[model samples]
Target: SAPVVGIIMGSQSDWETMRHADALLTELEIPHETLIVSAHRTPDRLADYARTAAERGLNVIIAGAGGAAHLPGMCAAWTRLPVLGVPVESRALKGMDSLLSIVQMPGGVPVGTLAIGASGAKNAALLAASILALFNPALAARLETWRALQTASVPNSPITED
Candidate 1:
């Protein structure tokens, strides 16, 4: 099936963080594609990818990057699709730089930035799923069930471990 969601990362190193998003989307049966699209090294590629994302049947974009992160912002520059930015933890500043770069959009271009590292990736996928659910009844039901199961699995109080 054609991908409705696109997960693009800055490099292979970003995969470790972005893969959580990929897994969550898969768990929900959301059709998605994951790939590496460097905003700094391959600006033209990022431009083209974001420009044609909608035409190619992509509804949401999840971009993960660390260090001097710009992939999410640049991708949003070319496409009107909702872009979720995940800040992968960096060795230098521990992703503060990446978080600032993503959260501070000039004006028009907007990127919905999430938390740093794996948690962000998971939430990004869930956020995209929720967005899509607003328009899809089937997916909405599925999402509700997932949420219910999650709630049911959690205990009321903290468990005492040996």
Candidate 2:
């Protein structure tokens, strides 16, 4: 299947955090691919990917970054495709830096940002799936089922120790 979702991170270390996006998309059966494209280290590669992403059949992009998170915003600048940013937990500020960087894009450029680290990655996948579901009823059904299962799995009461 042609990939509809693109998962990109700044570094190999980012994969440790971004893998949740991959796993969720896999479980959802959403055809997706991953890449390591950094705005700082590999600006040219990032530009090419963003510029050609739509032509490559990609509908949504999930970008994960830690400090100085410019990957998602730059990707947004090059394409009209929806981008979701996942802020990685940094050693210094615990991802606050990442969050601020990704979320502070100027008007006319938008990168829908998620939480910090793993939760952010997971939500990015879910949000991407939601975007795709608008054009894919089968995928939407699967997403609904997944949500139902998740809801069912949550206990109504919190556990307490004596």
Candidate 3:
């Protein structure tokens, strides 16, 4: 099967956070695959996946990791395909460590960073859809509908819960 997006999480535990991305991707009707490859534990598998991702027809890569999140950067280094990073809320620092790890990439290497946790995960999926739309008109229309639904989801502003 042909896939346009790739969702990779550093650990299976990260799935709780990464699932936001998956949910959004589903809403957009974008076909994708998810993987669990740790930067610290399975560097070789991460490398292999990133190196061969494009040839396998993946256009966007979404990587989520906690602590010192390095998976996105590593994937970006290996592939020309756009890589978006989500900083999972860490147990110790609440994902600041992960955000810094991702946002501080040097000049040539960069991963589009998102807010920590669920919001970030959701945005990652949206970003991927936006990018994919550049090459696909039908997908672009679906993305517009996705955006409209997201807008409709909001309640007009912050409200005080009395």
Candidate 4:
């Protein structure tokens, strides 16, 4: 089956965070693939992947990068398909730099950015599913069920240990 989503990271190390996206997509039973495509290190590869993604049967792209996180915005620049960015937590600036780089795009190029690190990755997957769900009823139902289950699992009130 054709993959509906694509996950890309700046490096293999970024997989630690990007894996959250992979896992969420798996749990949702959404077909997806992951790759390490750096905007700075491997510009050509990034260009090819982004430019051809839609034609290659992908509906959304989730890109996670740290430090000078240009991966997502660049991908968005290359493709018309929705691109979601996950800012991988960085040891140097605690991912603040990554978050800025990913979220601060130019006037036209838009990369829907998530939070820093793991939560960002997971949300990217969910966002991708939500985008797809607009056209796919089965996916819509699955997403609703997932949301309901998550809501059901939450505690009624906050707990504190003193």
Candidate 5:
């Protein structure tokens, strides 16, 4: 499948955190793919993937990493394609370091930053769909339908646990 979105995590362990992006993309009917890529472990592979992503039919990229997360920044540096970064909750600081690493890129390269953990990954998927919608009418329609479904799925009000 020609992926409209690419969800990449620092490692397989991150799948638990980044799968929210995958689920949302599936719900939106947007073709997506996932990868277990580590900037620290496989920098060359990461660079090659980023460089070839657009030509490989990927319009958007969502990268998830924790601690000193360099995946997003490195990916952005290698490719011109817009990248969304989801900082996974880390051990010491619960991704504060991840957030800063992703958010604190130098002037040239940029990773569209997101929140820590699931919410961030989820929104990254939505944002990717939005970006693709600029050129894809079908995707735009799908997004609208997905939004309506989401609205319908919400409860009337917050439920108390008590």
Candidate 6:
């Protein structure tokens, strides 16, 4: 499967968090590419990557960062493709810094920001899949079933594990 989505993170340290995004994409059998493209370390790489994404067949970009992030904003500027941000739990501020930086995007740059850490990772992948589902009938059915299973498994009432 050719890559339709690209998952970019700040560092290898982020792989611990970003891998969840890859796992969900893998579960749904979505074709995607994941890499470490730091905003500070490899700003030019992100610029080149973002600028070339649409022409290269990338439909979406999911970016996550711990302690820092300028990626999603840059991506949104460079590509019209939907950009989803996942805030990795950072050491200094426990991801609050990551969250604020990512969520701070204003008028021109738009990013669909998810929550901090793993929750963000899972949802970003699902959200990206939903975007893809717009053009994929089969994938849409799979997503429906996926949601149905989760809904069916929900506990209607809270109970003590006594």
Taking all chains together, the TM-score of candidate 3 against the true structure is: 0.93
TM-score of each prediction: 0.97, 0.97, 0.93, 0.95, 0.92, 0.95
Residue 86's lDDT within candidate 2 is 96
Model 6 over residues 1-162: C-alpha lDDT tens digits?
899999998888888888999999989989999988888888899899898999989999999887767777777888888899999998889899889989999888799999999999999999999999999999999999999999999998899689
lDDT of each: 0.95, 0.94, 0.92, 0.93, 0.90, 0.90
Weakest 10 consecutive residues of candidate 1 by summed lDDT: 153-162
> Which wins on TM-score, candidate 2 or candidate 4?
2
The C-alpha stretches of model 1 lying farther than 4 A from their native spots are: none
Model 4, global lDDT = 0.93
Q: Where in model 6 is the C-alpha error above 4 Å?
A: 157-161
lDDT of 1 at 80: 90
Q: RMSD to the native, candidate 2?
A: 0.9
How far out, in Å, is residue 10 in model 5?
Answer: 1.4
Model 2, range 1-162, lDDT digits (tens) per residue?
A: 989999999899999999999999999999999999989999999999999999999999999999888899999999989999999999999999999999999899999999998998999999999999999999999999999999999998888878
C-alpha RMSD by candidate, in order:
1.0, 0.9, 1.7, 1.3, 1.6, 1.2
Could you give candidate 5's per-residue lDDT for residues 1-162 as a string of tens digits?
A: 678788898898899889999998998788888998899999889989999999998888999999989999899988889999999999889889989999998898889998998899899988988888888898899898888988999999898889
Which residue runs of candidate 2 sit more than 4 Å off their true CA positions?
Answer: none
Summarize candidate 3's per-residue lDDT along 3-83 as a digit string, tens digits.
Answer: 789999988889999999999889888999988988889999998999999999999999999898899999999999989
Give lDDT for model 2.
0.94
Residue-wise C-alpha lDDT for candidate 4, range 2-82, written one tens digit per residue: 788999998999999999999999998999888889899899999999999999999999999999889999999999998
Best-to-worst ranking by TM-score? 2, 1, 4, 6, 3, 5
Give the TM-score comparing model 5 with the true structure, all chains together: 0.92
